[PDB]
Design a protein around this ligand. Structure first.
Ligand SMILES: *[B]([O])([O])[C]([C][C]([C])[C])[N]C(=O)[C]([C]C1=[C][C]=[C][C]=[C]1)[N]C(=O)C1=[C]N=[C][C]=N1
Ligand SMILES: *[B]([O])([O])[C]([C][C]([C])[C])[N]C(=O)[C]([C]C1=[C][C]=[C][C]=[C]1)[N]C(=O)C1=[C]N=[C][C]=N1
Ligand SMILES: *[B]([O])([O])[C]([C][C]([C])[C])[N]C(=O)[C]([C]C1=[C][C]=[C][C]=[C]1)[N]C(=O)C1=[C]N=[C][C]=N1
Ligand SMILES: *[B]([O])([O])[C]([C][C]([C])[C])[N]C(=O)[C]([C]C1=[C][C]=[C][C]=[C]1)[N]C(=O)C1=[C]N=[C][C]=N1
Ligand SMILES: [Cl-]
Ligand SMILES: [Cl-]
Ligand SMILES: [Mg+2]
Ligand SMILES: [Mg+2]
Ligand SMILES: [Mg+2]
Ligand SMILES: [Mg+2]
Ligand SMILES: [Mg+2]
Lengths: 195, 222, 233, 226, 212, 204, 196, 195, 196
C-alpha cells in the first residue's frame, strides 16, 4: 500500500496509516486498516506488495499471540521487533521474499518508555523518535526535524502529525483517502476516530 | 532453443440436435505449408456413446484422447461397469487439462453425445480446462469462419419475420439430422475455400440412442 | 534442450499392393561439412519391419540400441518369439512414439524424425511417422525433411489415395522411390549419391538393398548455360 | 505461390497458380500472377503481391518508352537488367521474385530474378513456396528438344504439383506461350480443377428478415438545373 | 468482463456479464460468470476463465467438507480465506483471478469479500471487477443507497452491467442476476443485452446519443 | 500497438444482378474503450463508393485525399471517374507510401455508367488489387466475414434479396468481434438509384 | 562455393563449381560463376550472388569505358576497380572475388580480393566455403610454370575434393582457359570427377 | 497532463479541465489552466506530454488569430477542428510527433448550434455530445450515457458535470486538485469561478 | 588443435600437435594431447582441455576396474565408455575425442566421437579445428594396409599442413605407435616438419 507514519513522544507512540486501496486504475476501498495488534501494548503497521502485506502481518500476529499464551507474558517491543527483523532477514534470501515494510510501535511496561522501530523488507531495523516508509519520509521528515520535541505530549504529537498529513495531501500526487490514527501507551491501544 | 509445441492445423465442429448429436472434423494434417496426411482421423469414438476431438497440436491431442479413453476404462472397473454420462465425462476432462495448467495441452477439445434425458449434448473446452455445455461450437483453425455462420443458420440470429420489420424474431424451430448434416457440409465446403489448412476430406460422427454412425465426404485437395 | 550436431537428411517411403518400400541416403553431415559417408540410417527389426531415421545421429544410435534391446526383451520367456508373439511394426512404432513424446515432455527431445515401415501379421501394410515433438501421422506416402517437399509430390502421383494401393505394383513403386532419391540429390545440399533401400512384402518378405547409387542423371544441358543474363561467351 | 518457366523447340512457356494468401487465409481464389512487360515479354511473380505488380508496371512502362525511343522491339535482357538493378538498389526490401520470359529479335529467353537482384539462366525454372514440388516434377520429366505441346503439359503439371502439395498454392493454372514469329497467347485459367461443388442448401433469406432503422435516397447526381 | 456485488437492506445483489474473448475474437456470449458454490454462497468470475472455474468449484468442495466436519454452515470470511490462501501458494506462477465471494450468515449478515490472484483479500460493501469495472462504478456510486428495495436494487445492478456492456468492448452478451438473502440466493434470469439495451433506452430515456 | 486494430471496424461488398452492395459498421474505439457510434467508413465520389477500415486518422486522411483527387479529375476530364479507373488511382496512391504506409484496408464498389457492369475491388495497406466477382471483405473481423460470405453468397441475386444476404453477413460477423459493431449501414446501388439503410443491431 | 584461379606457363585458368544454395535447398545446380569483365579478364564469384553480379556488371562497364578511351586495361587495373568497389562499400557487401587475366606483356596473373576489400597478387588463389578443405592439398600439389593439361588436372582434382566435403558446393566443374591462343570453356560432369 | 472533459448541451459547450501539474513525485502547481482561447467563440482544452501541450496549443492559437486578422472573420468550429486535426495528422509521421490530445468546444454563430470535437494525438476527429481524453472517459461515460439528454440547459449540464467530477474524485487514484470549468455559448467564453 | 588416428598393416598410430590456446595467447606450446586410458588403448583429445581431461581420467578408471574383473577390454569397449560419457552429458561437454587401440584379435582400430556423442568406426580419423584444412589431402593420400614408415609420413605431412593453416595448432608433432611389438613415442620438431 502507500503511506505509513510513526512518532514516539514522551509517554506514547502514534501510528498513522492511509485508508486507500488501489488496484491499478480504481480505488476499490477507502477505509482499509493497515495494521495488526501483535500484543496488548504492541502495534504493527505495514505497507508493501498486495497480499504479502496482510499474509506477513497475520503470520507475525499469530506467532506473538502463541508466545503470549505459552509463557503467559508479553514480549517487550524490542524483543518483538528483533523477531520481526529476523523473519524479514530470513525472507530476503528466500525463493519468493516477503515484499513488506513495517513500523512497530510499542510501550515497554518494564522500562515505562514508548518505543518505535522502523523495519524494511530487507530486515533493516532502526529505533527512532519518528519514522516512515516509502515516499512519506520525503515530505514529512523536514517538518519532524524542526518541530519534534521528545517531551512532547500526545496531543502535541497529534498536531505535529496533522501538519505532516496536510503536507502530504498538498504535495503528493496520489489520493490516499486520509489516514487511520492509533495511539500506543501504558493503557494499551486505541483508535482516534476523528482525524 | 527447443520449442515443445507445434501446429497441425485442422478444424472441428459439434452440433447438438433434439435427440441426436454430431461431431465433425476435417481429415487433413499439416505443418507450416506442407501436408502430412490427407486422411488422418481426428474425431474418435471413446465408448459410452461419447465422441471426442482435441484439435490443435496433434501430439497433445492424441495424448489427451488416449488418457480420456483410459479414464473411461478405469471408470468401468472402479464403479461396476456404470455408463459414464456426458456431463461426468466433461468434468473429468477439465481435470485432465488443468492438471497440466503450467505446461498445457495445446488443444481445443470438443465432446458430443446424449445427456441423461436422451437430448443432444455438446461440450467445449479451452486448453487449460474450462468448459461449458453448448448447442453449437466450431474449434480450430477455421473456427472464426464457421461460428458466425452457425449463429445465423442454427440459432437464427439477426433474423426476423417478414412484414413485422424487426419486431418479431424468427422462431427457433428444431433441426432434423438431415438438416444438420447439410449445414455441416456447407460449413466445411466454405471453410475449405478460404482457409489453406482445411481440406482433403470431411468425417462426421453421428450419435443417437441406437449408437454411433459414421459418414465421410470428399473435400477439395488444393 | 540441445542442438543437433551430426545429422542425417531425408527418409522417404510409400505403400504398394503387397507391401511397403522405404529409403534413405548414407550421409552424416556436420553442418555444411559432409563429414561421414558410410552411415546406415535404415535399421531393420526382425523380418517384418524397417525403421528409417533422420536428424541427430547420436540420438539415432541411441534409438538403434533401444530397438536392439527391445528384440532381446521380447524373446525373454517367449516360446512364440519367432511366430505369433513376434514384434509387429505397430508394436515397435507405438513404443518409439511413446518415448519421443515423453522426451519432448521433459524438454529434452531425441532430435529426430522417424518412419516405421512394415507388414503386419494379417498381411496389412503398415507405414507411420513420428518426430521429436511426438507428432504422428500415416499416409500412403511418407517422407521427412526435404523429402516432404520434393518426394511426396512425386510419390503421390503414383498413389494419390487409398484405392490406388492395390493398383500399384512393386516394380512401379520402386521405380518411383529411386527417381525421388535422384531428385533429392539434384536439389538437397546435405544429401549424397549413395543410399540404401528396403522392401517389405507380404509374400517375398524383407529385401534390404545396400550401396545403391543415383544414376541416369541429366547434366549435359549445363554446357549451354553461360553467365547470368547478358554474357554470351 | 508456384510459378514455372519452360523452354521449348521454338520458344518459351510460363505458368502460375492463382492463389493469394494473407497468413493462413485465402485473399483471392482466382488471382492473376502472369504479368505483361511488353507484347512478347511476360513474367510471373512470387512474393509480395504489390511489389511484383509495381516493379513489373514500372519496367514495362520504361521498356515501352525505350522501344519507342529506339524504334526496336524490346529485348528480354533489357527487362532483366532494368529489373535487377532496381531490386538491387532497394537491397531486397522490394519483395519481388520473378521468372522473366519472352521472344525478341535475338531469340527466345528464360531468366529468374530474386529480390536482392541476383539473376539466373536456365531451360527450366521454378519460384515460390511451391517451387520444390514443381521442381521435383521438372527434374523428373524435363528433356531437351521439347515441343510446344510437351512444354505446356510439363509446365501445367509442375503447377499442379504446387497446387495439390503446397498450401501456399491452389485453385487454377494460368499459362502464357511465347513462340518465335508468332503472337504470344495468354491462356487465362488454362486448367480449372478446383470448382466448388453445389451447396446442400440455399441461404436466400425471406424479404424483410433484417431489421432496419432508417431509409434514405443517396444523391449521386450532380447539382441540378432550374 | 464486468462483475459487481453490493450490500444493501435486502441482502446482496450480484450482477455479471456473459462475454469471453480471445484477443479481439468473441469466444462466447453465453458464459456463466456466477458460480453457485452452495444454496447460500456465490462466487464471481473475472480474469482467467479456467482458473476461476476450476478453483471456485474446488472451493465448493472445501466448503461442503467444512460443514460435514463442523456440522455448521461455513462463514463467508472462512470460505473467502480458503480461496485466498490457496492462490497465495500459487503466487508468481501466473494465476489470473478477480473474484467476489458473496454470502449471508447469521453471525456476519450479508458479506462480500474481494479475492484476487495477487493474494489480496478485502471485505467491503461495493465491488466492481473486470475490464469494464470503471463504467459500472459510475452508475453504482451515484445511485447506491442502503435503503433500496429488492426490485430497485436488482435493476441498478442490471443497469450498471448494461452501462459497461455498451462501452467496454470486452464485456457484453447478457446479464445474469442473483439476489442473496439469508435463506439463500435467488436467480433472476438471463437478460440479452441486444433486447435489454433498446428496452431500457426507450423506457428510461437514456442513451440519447444512440439512434433507435 | 498494432495500428490496424487500435480503432476497429469492418467493411464488406457484394455483387448481384445489375447491382452492387457495400456495407460497414459504425464503431470507433480506443482499444477496449468505445468512443463513437457514428463513425461511417463508406464514402462516395460521384457514383463510385469507397469503404475504408483500419487506423481511423488514415481513414479520414485518405477520404480527404481521394475527394481532392477525384475533384481535380472531374474538372480536367469533364466527367465522373469510373470504378475501374478509381481502383487504379487508389492503388497508385497507396504504393507511393511503400515504406511508410497508411494503415488501412480500402474497398471499392460501383456500377460502370457506360457498360452497366457491376464492379467491386479490395486492397491491402500498400496497393495490391483484389478484384473478385462475388465479394470483398476488410477489417478486424475479416476472417468472420469470409466465412459468412463464402456460405451465404449466391450469384445473380436481386437488389432486395442481396440486401438481406450482405446485412446478415455483416451483422453476424460483427457480433463475433469485440472491436466491431455499435451500428451498421448498408448501401444498395443500382445504375441510377442508391438506397441507404441503417441496421438495428446489438449495442455491446 | 568452391572457386580457384591458377597461373601456368601459357597463361591462367579459372575454375568453379555450379551450385547456388538457399540454406540447404539448391536454388540452381547449373550456375555459371565464371564471369567475363573483359575479353581476357575474367573473375570467379563467391559470397552473395546479387552483390557479386552487381559488382561484376559495374566493373564490366568501367573496363568497357576504359577500353574506349585508353585501350585494353591490365589485369592489375581490373583488380583495382574491383577493390575500389569492395573496399569503399565493405559495410554493405558480401563478396569474395578472384580476378584472373592474360596480358601479352605480363602473361597470366591472379589477384584475390577477400571480404575486407584488400588485394593480394598470388601465383594461384582459392576461395569460397569449399576452399577450406583443400588448402592442404593445393599447397602440396601446386607448382609454378605447369602445362595446360597439368593445370586442368590440378584444378579438377582440387575442386573435386572441395565439392566432396562442402555441401554448399557441387554440380558441374566449369573452367575457363586464358592464353594468347584465346578463350576456351571447359565443363566436367559428376560421373567424371567423382571417380577421381 | 491528466483529466479533460467536455459536454455539448442545448445552447452551449462546457469544458472541464484539471488544475494539477505533477512532475514525478511532487505536485508543483494546483491552479493550472489547461486551455487556450482560439477565437471569441472557440475554446480548446488539451492534455498530453509536458511542454508539447502548451507549445502545440499556443501554435494553433497563433494560426487561428492570424486567420481572424487576415480575413476579419471568425472560422466555424468545424473549420478550426479540421485545421487542428490536419496539424496532428501531419505531426504523427514527423521526426518527433506532438504528443497532445485536445477537445475543441465552439459555438457556431451561423447555425446557432454548440459543437464539441474530440481529437487525439494521431489526428482522430469525432463530433460528440460529450467527450473525454485519457482514463477520464472510463469513469464518466456511463453516467453521461444515462443522464444526458440532448436538450439540457447549461445549469443541468453543470450538475451532470459535477456528478462526473465527484465520481472521478472517488475512484481515480491521482489527486488532480479539482477542475477549471469554462462555458462556450453565443455570448462567447466565460469561466465558472466557483466549482 | 590438429589430431588424427590412422590404422595400418601392423596396427594403429595416433598423431597430434602440442598447442593449447586462450584466445590468441598460446598457454602451452608443448602440450601432450595423446593420452593413455589403457596399455594399448590411447586417445586424441580436442575441444575443452578440462572436459577431455576429466573424461579421459574417468575412462582410465573404468578400464582399470574392467581389467581387474574381466581382463583386457577391447577398443570397441573403450569407445563405448567414452561415448556413454559424451552422449549422456552432451549439454555440459565440449569434447571431440578419437579413440585408437590395438588388440591381437582385432588388430588396429579407430573410433571417432564428435561433439554430439555419436560413434563412428573408421579406417582413419581426423579432428580438431585444424582438421578442416586437410580433408582434401587425407582423402587423396590415405591407403589401407600401409607400412609403419608410410603411415608416419602420412600423419607427419597431414598435421604439417594443418599446423601451417590453423592458428590454433602448432608446436611439435607428437605421435604414439600401437602394435604387437609395444608402445613407441615419436616427436617431430618445427625445423623438421616445416620444410616438408
Ligand atoms: B505467392 O504465395 O508468392 C503469392 C503470389 C503473389 C505475388 C500474388 N504471394 C502472396 O499471396 C503474398 C504472401 C505474402 C503475405 C504477407 C507478406 C508478404 C507476402 N500475399 C500478399 O502480398 C498479399 C496479402 N494480402 C493482400 C494482398 N496481397
Ligand atoms: B473477462 O473479460 O475478464 C473474462 C472473464 C472470464 C471468467 C470469462 N475473461 C476473458 O474473457 C479472458 C480474456 C480477458 C479479457 C479481458 C480481461 C482479462 C481477460 N478470456 C480467457 O481467459 C479465455 C481463455 N480461453 C479462451 C477464451 N478466453
Ligand atoms: B557460393 O556458395 O558462395 C555461392 C556463390 C554465388 C556467387 C553463386 N553463393 C551462394 O550460393 C549464396 C549463399 C551463400 C552460400 C555460401 C556462402 C555464402 C553465400 N546464395 C545466394 O546468394 C543466393 C541464394 N539463393 C538465391 C539467390 N542468391
Ligand atoms: B585444441 O585447440 O582443440 C585444444 C585441445 C585441448 C585438448 C588441449 N583445445 C584448446 O586449446 C582449448 C581452446 C580451444 C581451441 C580451439 C578449439 C576448441 C577449444 N583450450 C582450453 O581448453 C584451455 C585454454 N587455456 C587454458 C586451459 N584450457
Ligand atoms: Cl550467379
Ligand atoms: Cl591438455
Ligand atoms: Mg528502514
Ligand atoms: Mg495445396
Ligand atoms: Mg486454503
Ligand atoms: Mg461492448
Ligand atoms: Mg599454426
Amino acid at each position: 500500500m502507500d503511506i505509513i507514519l510513526g512518532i514516539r513522544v514522551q509517554d506514547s507512540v502514534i501510528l498513522a496509516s492511509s485508508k486507500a486501496v488501489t488496484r491499478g486504475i480504481s480505488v476499490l476501498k477507502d477505509s482499509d486498516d493497515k495494521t495488526r495488534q501483535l500484543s496488548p501494548h504492541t502495534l504493527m503497521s505495514f505497507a508493501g506488495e498486495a497480499g504479502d502485506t496482510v499474509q506477513f502481518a497475520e503470520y507475525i500476529q499469530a506467532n506473538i499471540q502463541l508466545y503470549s499464551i505459552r509463557e503467559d507474558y508479553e514480549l517487550s517491543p524490542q524483543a518483538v521487533s528483533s523477531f520481526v527483523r529476523q523473519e524479514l532477514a530470513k525472507s530476503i534470501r528466500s525463493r519468493r521474499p516477503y515484499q513488506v515494510n513495517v513500523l512497530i510501535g510499542g510501550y515497554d511496561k518494564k522500562k515505562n518508555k514508548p518505543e518505535l522501530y522502523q523495519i524494511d523488507y530487507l530486515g533493516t531495523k532502526v529505533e527512532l523518535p519518528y519514522g516512515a516508509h516509502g515516499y512519506s519520509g520525503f515530505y514529512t521528515f523536514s517538518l519532524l526535524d524542526h518541530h519534534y520535541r521528545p517531551d512532547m505530549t500526545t496531543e502535541e504529537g497529534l498536531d505535529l502529525l496533522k501538519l505532516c498529513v496536510q503536507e502530504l495531501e498538498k504535495r503528493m500526487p496520489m489520493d490516499f483517502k486520509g489516514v487511520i490514527v492509533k495511539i500506543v501507551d501504558k493503557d494499551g491501544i486505541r483508535q482516534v476516530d476523528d482525524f | 532453443q527447443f520449442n515443445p509445441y507445434g501446429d497441425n492445423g485442422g478444424t472441428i465442429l459439434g452440433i447438438a440436435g433434439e435427440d441426436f448429436a454430431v461431431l465433425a472434423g476435417d481429415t487433413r494434417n499439416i505443418t507450416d505449408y506442407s501436408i502430412n496426411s490427407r486422411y488422418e482421423p481426428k474425431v474418435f469414438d471413446c465408448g459410452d456413446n461419447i465422441v471426442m476431438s482435441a484439435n490443435g497440436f496433434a501430439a497433445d491431442g492424441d495424448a489427451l484422447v488416449k488418457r480420456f479413453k483410459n479414464s473411461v476404462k478405469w471408470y468401468h472397473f472402479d464403479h461396476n461397469d456404470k455408463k459414464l454420462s456426458i456431463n461426468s465425462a466433461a468434468r473429468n476432462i477439465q481435470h485432465l487439462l488443468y492438471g497440466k495448467r503450467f505446461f498445457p495441452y495445446y488443444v481445443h477439445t470438443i465432446i458430443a453425445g446424449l445427456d441423461e434425458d436422451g437430448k443432444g449434448a455438446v461440450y467445449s473446452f479451452d486448453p487449460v480446462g474450462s468448459y461449458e455445455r453448448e448447442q453449437c461450437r466450431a474449434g480450430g483453425a477455421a473456427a472464426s469462419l464457421i461460428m458466425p455462420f452457425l449463429d445465423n443458420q442454427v440459432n437464427f440470429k439477426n433474423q426476423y419475420e417478414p412484414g413485422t420489420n424487426g419486431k418479431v424474431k424468427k422462431p427457433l424451430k428444431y433441426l432434423s439430422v438431415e438438416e444438420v448434416i447439410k449445414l455441416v457440409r456447407d460449413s466445411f465446403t466454405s471453410a475449405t475455400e478460404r482457409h489453406i489448412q482445411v481440406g482433403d476430406g470431411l468425417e462426421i460422427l453421428i450419435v443417437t440412442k441406437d449408437g454411433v454412425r459414421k459418414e465421410f465426404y470428399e473435400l477439395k485437395r488444393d | 534442450t540441445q542442438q543437433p550436431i551430426v545429422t542425417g537428411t531425408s527418409v522417404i517411403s510409400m505403400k504398394y499392393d503387397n507391401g511397403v518400400i522405404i529409403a534413405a541416403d548414407n550421409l552424416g553431415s556436420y553442418g555444411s561439412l559432409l563429414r561421414f559417408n558410410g552411415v546406415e540410417r535404415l535399421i531393420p527389426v526382425g523380418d517384418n519391419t524397417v525403421v528409417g531415421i533422420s536428424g541427430d545421429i547420436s540420438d539415432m544410435q541411441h534409438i538403434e540400441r533401444l530397438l536392439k534391446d527391445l528384440v532381446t526383451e521380447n524373446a525373454y520367456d517367449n516360446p512364440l518369439a519367432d511366430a505369433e508373439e513376434a514384434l509387429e511394426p505397430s508394436y515397435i512404432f507405438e513404443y518409439l512414439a511413446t518415448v519421443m513424446y515423453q522426451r519432448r515432455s521433459k524438454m529434452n527431445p531425441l532430435w529426430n524424425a522417424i518412419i516405421v515401415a512394415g507388414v503386419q501379421s494379417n498381411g496389412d501394410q503398415f507405414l507411420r511417422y513420428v518426430n521429436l515433438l511426438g507428432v504422428t501421422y500415416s499416409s500412403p506416402t511418407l517422407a521427412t525433411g526435404f523429402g516432404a517437399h520434393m518426394a511426396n509430390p512425386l510419390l503421390r502421383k503414383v498413389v494419390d489415395r487409398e484405392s490406388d494401393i492395390p493398383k500399384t505394383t512393386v516394380q512401379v513403386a520402386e521405380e518411383a522411390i529411386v527417381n525421388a532419391m535422384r531428385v533429392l540429390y539434384y536439389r538437397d545440399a546435405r544429401s549424397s549419391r549413395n543410399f540404401s533401400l528396403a522392401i517389405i512384402d507380404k509374400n517375398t518378405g524383407l529385401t534390404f538393398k545396400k550401396n545403391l547409387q543415383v544414376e541416369n542423371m541429366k547434366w549435359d544441358f549445363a554446357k549451354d548455360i553461360k553467365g547470368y543474363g547478358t554474357q554470351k561467351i | 505461390t508456384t510459378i514455372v518457366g519452360v523452354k521449348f523447340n521454338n520458344g518459351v512457356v510460363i505458368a502460375a497458380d492463382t492463389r493469394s494468401t494473407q497468413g493462413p487465409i485465402v485473399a483471392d481464389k482466382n488471382c492473376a500472377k502472369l504479368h505483361r512487360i511488353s507484347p512478347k515479354i511476360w513474367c510471373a511473380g512470387a512474393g509480395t503481391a504489390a511489389d511484383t505488380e509495381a516493379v513489373t508496371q514500372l519496367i514495362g512502362s520504361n521498356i515501352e518508352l525505350h522501344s519507342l525511343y529506339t524504334s526496336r522491339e524490346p529485348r528480354v535482357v533489357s527487362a532483366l537488367q532494368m529489373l535487377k538493378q532496381h531490386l538491387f538498389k532497394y537491397q531486397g526490401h522490394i519483395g519481388a521474385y520473378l521468372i522473366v520470359a519472352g521472344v525478341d529479335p535475338t531469340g527466345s529467353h528464360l531468366f529468374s530474378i530474386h529480390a536482392h537482384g541476383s539473376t539466373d539462366v536456365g531451360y527450366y525454372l521454378s519460384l515460390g513456396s511451391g517451387s520444390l514440388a514443381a521442381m521435383a516434377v521438372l527434374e523428373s520429366h524435363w528433356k531437351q528438344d521439347l515441343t510446344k505441346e510437351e512444354a505446356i503439359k510439363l509446365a501445367s503439371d509442375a503447377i499442379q504439383a504446387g497446387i495439390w502439395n503446397d498450401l501456399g498454392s491452389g485453385s487454377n493454372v494460368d499459362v502464357c506461350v511465347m513462340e518465335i514469329g508468332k503472337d504470344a497467347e495468354y491462356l487465362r485459367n488454362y486448367l480449372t480443377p478446383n470448382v466448388r461443388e453445389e451447396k446442400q442448401k440455399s441461404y436466400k433469406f425471406p424479404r424483410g428478415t433484417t431489421a432496419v432503422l432508417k431509409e434514405s435516397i443517396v444523391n449521386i447526381c450532380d447539382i441540378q438545373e432550374e | 468482463t464486468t462483475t459487481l456485488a453490493f450490500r444493501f437492506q435486502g441482502g446482496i445483489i450480484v450482477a455479471v456479464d456473459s462475454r469471453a474473448t480471445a484477443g479481439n475474437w468473441v469466444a462466447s456470449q453465453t458464459v456463466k460468470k456466477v458460480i453457485e458454490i452452495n444454496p447460500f454462497l456465490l462466487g464471481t468470475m473475472a480474469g482467467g476463465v479456467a482458473d476461476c472455474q476450476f478453483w471456485e468449484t474446488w472451493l465448493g468442495s472445501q466448503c461442503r467438507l467444512h460443514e460435514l466436519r463442523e456440522k455448521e454452515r461455513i462463514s463467508v470470511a472462512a470460505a473467502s480465506k480458503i480461496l485466498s490462501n490457496l492462490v497465495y501458494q500459487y503466487k508468481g506462477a501466473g494465476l489470473s483471478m478477480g473474484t467476489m465471494i458473496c454470502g449471508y450468515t447469521r453471525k456476519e449478515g450479508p458479506t462480500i469479500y474481494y479475492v484476487d490472484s495477487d493474494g489480496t483479500r478485502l471485505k467491503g460493501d461495493i465491488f466492481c471487477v473486470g475490464s469494464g469495472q470503471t463504467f459500472a462504478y459510475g452508475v453504482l456510486d451515484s445511485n447506491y443507497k442502503w435503503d433500496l428495495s429488492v426490485e430497485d436494487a436488482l435493476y441498478l445492478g442490471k443497469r450498471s452491467i448494461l452501462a459497461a456492456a455498451h462501452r467496454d468492448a470486452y464485456s457484453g452478451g447478457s446479464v445474469n442476476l442473483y439476489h442473496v438473502t439469508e435463506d439463500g440466493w435467488i436467480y433472476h434470469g438471463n437478460h440479452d443485452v441486444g433486447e435489454l439495451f433498446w428496452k431500457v433506452k426507450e423506457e428510461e430515456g437514456s442513451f440519447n446519443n444512440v439512434i433507435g | 500497438s498494432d495500428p490496424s486494430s487500435i480503432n476497429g471496424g469492418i467493411v464488406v461488398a457484394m455483387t448481384g444482378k445489375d447491382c452492387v452492395a457495400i456495407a460497414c459498421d459504425l464503431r470507433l474505439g480506443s482499444q477496449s474503450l468505445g468512443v463513437s457510434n457514428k463513425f461511417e467508413k463508406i464514402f462516395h465520389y460521384g457514383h463510385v463508393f469507397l469503404g475504408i477500415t483500419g487506423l481511423a486518422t488514415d481513414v479520414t486522411t485518405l477520404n480527404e485525399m481521394f475527394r481532392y483527387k477525384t475533384n481535380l479529375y472531374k474538372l480536367k476530364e469533364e466527367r465522373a471517374i469510373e470504378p475501374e479507373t478509381f481502383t487504379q488511382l487508389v492503388s497508385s496512391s497507396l504504393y507511393e507510401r511503400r515504406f511508410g504506409p497508411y494503415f488501412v484496408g480500402p474497398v471499392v464498389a460501383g456500377i460502370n455508367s457506360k457498360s452497366g457492369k457491376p464492379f467491386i475491388a479490395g486492397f491491402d495497406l500498400i496497393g495490391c488489387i483484389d478484384e473478385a466477382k462475388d465479394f470483398i471483405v476488410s477489417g478486424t473481423a475479416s476472417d468472420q466475414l469470409f466465412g459468412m460470405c463464402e456460405s451465404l453468397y449466391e450469384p445473380n441475386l436481386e437488389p432486395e434479396d442481396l440486401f438481406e444476404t450482405i446485412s446478415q453477413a455483416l451483422l453476424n460477423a460483427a457480433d463475433r468481434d469485440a472491436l466491431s459493431g455499435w451500428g451498421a449501414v448498408v448501401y444498395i446501388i443500382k445504375k441510377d438509384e442508391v438506397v441507404k439503410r441503417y441496421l438495428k443491431m446489438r449495442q455491446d | 562455393t568452391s572457386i580457384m584461379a591458377v597461373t601456368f606457363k601459357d597463361g591462367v585458368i579459372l575454375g568453379a563449381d555450379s551450385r547456388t544454395t538457399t540454406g540447404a535447398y539448391i536454388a540452381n545446380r547449373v550456375t555459371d560463376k565464371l564471369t567475363r569483365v573483359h575479353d581476357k579478364i575474367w573473375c570467379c564469384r563467391s559470397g552473395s550472388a546479387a552483390d557479386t553480379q552487381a559488382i561484376a556488371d559495374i566493373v564490366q562497364y568501367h573496363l568497357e569505358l576504359y577500353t574506349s578511351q585508353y585501350g585494353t586495361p591490365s589485369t592489375e587495373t581490373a583488380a583495382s576497380v574491383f577493390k575500389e568497389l569492395c573496399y569503399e562499400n565493405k559495410d554493405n557487401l558480401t563478396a569474395g572475388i578472384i580476378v584472373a587475366g592474360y596480358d601479352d606483356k605480363n602473361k597470366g596473373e591472379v589477384y584475390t580480393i577477400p571480404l575486407g576489400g584488400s588485394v593480394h597478387k598470388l601465383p594461384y588463389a582459392i576461395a569460397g566455403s569449399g576452399s577450406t578443405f583443400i588448402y592442404g592439398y593445393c599447397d602440396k600439389n601446386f607448382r609454378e610454370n605447369m602445362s595446360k593439361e597439368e593445370t586442368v588436372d590440378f584444378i579438377k582434382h582440387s575442386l573435386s575434393q572441395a565439392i566432396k566435403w562442402d555441401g554448399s558446393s557441387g554440380g558441374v566443374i566449369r573452367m575457363v582457359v586464358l592464353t594468347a591462343a584465346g578463350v576456351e570453356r571447359l565443363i566436367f560432369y559428376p560421373d567424371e570427377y567423382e571417380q577421381l
